[PDB]
Design an enzyme around this catalytic site. Structure first.
Site, short mmCIF file in Angstrom:
data_model
loop_
_atom_site.label_atom_id
_atom_site.label_comp_id
_atom_site.label_asym_id
_atom_site.label_seq_id
_atom_site.Cartn_x
_atom_site.Cartn_y
_atom_site.Cartn_z
N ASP A 60 -1.47 63.21 -72.30
CA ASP A 60 -0.82 62.05 -71.73
C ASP A 60 -0.92 62.10 -70.24
O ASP A 60 -0.99 63.16 -69.66
CB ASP A 60 0.65 62.08 -72.12
CG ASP A 60 1.38 60.86 -71.70
OD1 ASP A 60 0.74 59.87 -71.37
OD2 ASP A 60 2.60 60.88 -71.70
N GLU A 63 -5.45 60.14 -67.37
CA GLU A 63 -6.48 59.20 -66.96
C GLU A 63 -7.55 59.67 -65.95
O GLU A 63 -8.70 59.27 -66.08
CB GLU A 63 -5.84 57.88 -66.54
CG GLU A 63 -4.93 57.31 -67.60
CD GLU A 63 -3.58 57.97 -67.62
OE1 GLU A 63 -3.26 58.69 -66.66
OE2 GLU A 63 -2.83 57.76 -68.58
N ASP A 81 2.48 53.41 -73.35
CA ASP A 81 3.92 53.35 -73.27
C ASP A 81 4.28 51.90 -73.08
O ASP A 81 3.74 51.21 -72.24
CB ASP A 81 4.44 54.20 -72.10
CG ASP A 81 4.15 55.67 -72.28
OD1 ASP A 81 4.45 56.21 -73.35
OD2 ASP A 81 3.60 56.29 -71.35
#
Length: 588
Positions: A276, A279, A340
């Site tokens: 998580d 990126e 999210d």
């Protein structure tokens, strides 16, 4: 046409074409005519309604001609482009080098997806508990909660499977380092989660905070990506720990280093891991990136290493790894988990469109959280959320930044009763979700299928993004009665927050029974759901196994085929074929 330098693309579209594709995307974008950017950073958020780059990159689209025909276009670039494709052609116009193109022209849209995997491959099999309802939480006031949430679930009799341990379990948000009052007894004192019919899920990140008093970050490393065309030193971004540093999945030296036999340290109690904020995402300096300044495969390659490591640490349990950010072939190692959320309600519907595309972008296992991060949610939102969210390929409970609530049981007994009724429905169809998990992995397309896949020839059915399909034979309508574009033909035949379920004529669905978790699984009383068609006939299959080998190397599966034929005033349901067999068999 032409392209030369900044690279580009080709492929003009016939008129009457329905455009799909784009991977993880925004809007009621079931269909396209919109342009999106391939790259990006925490662009999930109040995600958004169309034109925005999000967490993952997929440079692919697919077209269905007004006929029933379909084609698939893959611009094979790992670089950072931008998809922007209205009715006037599909073009991807990029900032790198010349790139390969691949074109599918097959008889079906269903054949384009199989075809994408043919080129890009499938998802490797997860365990059957990856198919269970999942939840997270964590709390403060004492040591943590000592779960109480796991007991709470079994107390409530709301089926749950896996409990994710969210963010805090780290010592300083220093990865691979539980908190030593967060129960320095993180060696998996959670036999509890295993005794109680559970499987652990733990967060992981690509950021290492700058401390020399750590026990991960090894700067007899080099792995930290160097910044700038050389410059001579590592990029310090700002992540969860702030001034953390990042592995370079540039070359294999870093990868070998990353897969450290990690989950067998605190446990064995780390069952699944999620990657998580990978990126990667930077909290500060200008728009979330890093310098060298190719971006879009960092999560893709972060997550391949985790699956690579869990495999090294534990040879065969099947790995169950998930990533926020990915890439087009990325489903070979990971599963999405879809961004999210917001608890807002535009996000609740949008999940249905967002997660359809992911299947058509090659990703069988995607789910949206039944709420999100951003939150506060009333009963009315969650209750509706759980009603069709209980049929996502991947289902989970969610939310953040409490102060309080987000649970299956907050918004009353009634909301909790809706939650029980949905989860009970999901679990009964585990033998049908499971077989479907298997299809997604041998050839298969989305577990969560478009209404439009029912008849690709039907025009009425092209844009329909609210109702949806599960595996051909089941139709799912989310909040409230009789809509909208629905497939023609025989369905059902012809409680508030619950979705409408319809069963296809000519269809056999394998049904198991209410279970708390996938632990009573090997023991499932089987009930075959039958709806006879226009000739009074039904056909269906079931796939089953132990749950921790694939279509097993040694064949420890049964693949069952049902036929049903109504001749007379009486129907027969039979067993046609029995492929495989299992729980033993070897070779000399």
């Amino acid at each position: 046409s032409l392209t030369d330098g900044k690279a580009n693309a080709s492929l003009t579209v016939p008129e009457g074409t329905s455009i799909y594709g784009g991977g993880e995307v925004t809007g009621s974008l079931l269909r396209n005519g919109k342009t999106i950017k391939l790259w990006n950073t925490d662009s999930g958020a109040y995600g958004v309604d169309k034109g925005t780059r999000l967490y993952q990159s997929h440079p692919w689209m697919m077209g269905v001609r007004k006929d029933g025909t379909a084609f698939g276009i893959l611009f094979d670039t790992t670089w950072k482009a931008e998809l922007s494709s209205t009715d006037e052609k599909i073009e991807l116009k990029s900032e790198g080098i010349p790139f390969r193109v691949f074109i599918i022209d097959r008889e079906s849209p269903q054949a384009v997806i199989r075809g994408l995997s043919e080129l890009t491959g499938t998802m490797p099999m997860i365990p059957r508990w990856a198919l269970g309802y999942q939840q997270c939480r964590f709390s403060y006031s004492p040591d943590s909660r000592v779960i109480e949430i796991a007991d709470t679930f079994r107390l409530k009799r709301i089926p749950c499977d896996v409990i994710w341990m969210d963010i805090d379990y780290m010592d300083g948000y220093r990865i691979f380092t539980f908190n030593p009052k967060s129960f320095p007894n993180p060696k998996a004192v959670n036999r509890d989660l295993h005794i109680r019919g559970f499987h652990s899920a733990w967060m992981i990140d690509p950021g290492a905070k700058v401390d020399p008093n750590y026990f991960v970050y090894k700067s007899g490393t080099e792995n930290d990506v160097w910044v700038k065309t050389a410059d001579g030193k590592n990029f310090h971004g700002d992540a969860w720990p702030g001034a953390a540093a990042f592995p370079d999945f540039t070359s294999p030296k870093v990868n070998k280093w990353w897969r450290n036999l990690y989950k067998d340290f605190l446990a064995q109690g780390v069952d699944g891991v999620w990657n998580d904020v990978n990126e990667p995402q930077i909290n500060d300096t200008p728009n979330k990136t890093m310098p060298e300044d190719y971006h879009n495969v960092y999560g893709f390659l972060m997550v391949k290493a985790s699956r690579e490591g869990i495999l090294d640490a534990r040879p065969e349990k099947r790995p169950f790894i998930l990533t926020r950010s990915n890439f087009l072939g990325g489903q070979r190692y990971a599963a999405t988990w879809t961004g999210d959320n917001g608890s807002c309600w535009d996000h609740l519907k949008m999940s249905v469109p967002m997660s359809l595309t992911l299947g058509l972008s090659g990703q069988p296992f995607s789910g949206a959280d039944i709420g999100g991060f951003l939150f506060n949610a009333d009963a009315d939102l969650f209750g509706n959320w759980i009603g069709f969210g209980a049929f996502y390929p991947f289902a989970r409970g969610h939310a953040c930044a409490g102060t309080n609530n987000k649970e299956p049981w907050v918004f009353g007994q009634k909301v909790e009763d809706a939650s029980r009724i949905a989860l009970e429905r999901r679990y009964i169809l585990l033998p049908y979700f499971y077989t479907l998990l298997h299809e997604a992995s041998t050839n298969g397309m989305p577990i969560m299928r478009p209404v439009f896949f029912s008849d690709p020839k039907d025009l009425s059915l092209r844009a329909e993004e609210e109702a949806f399909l599960v595996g051909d034979n089941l139709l799912i309508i989310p909040a409230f009665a009789n809509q909208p574009a629905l497939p023609k033909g025989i369905w059902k035949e012809l409680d508030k927050y619950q979705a409408k379920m319809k069963i296809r004529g000519g269809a056999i669905i394998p049904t198991g029974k209410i279970i708390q978790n996938t632990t009573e699984n090997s023991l499932d009383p089987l009930t075959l759901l039958v709806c006879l068609d226009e000739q009074g006939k039904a056909s269906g299959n079931m796939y089953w196994d132990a749950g921790d080998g694939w279509s097993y190397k040694k064949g420890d599966y049964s693949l069952l085929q049902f036929v049903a034929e109504r001749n007379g005033d009486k129907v027969t349901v039979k067993l046609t074929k029995k492929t495989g067999k299992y729980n033993t068999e070897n070779k000399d």
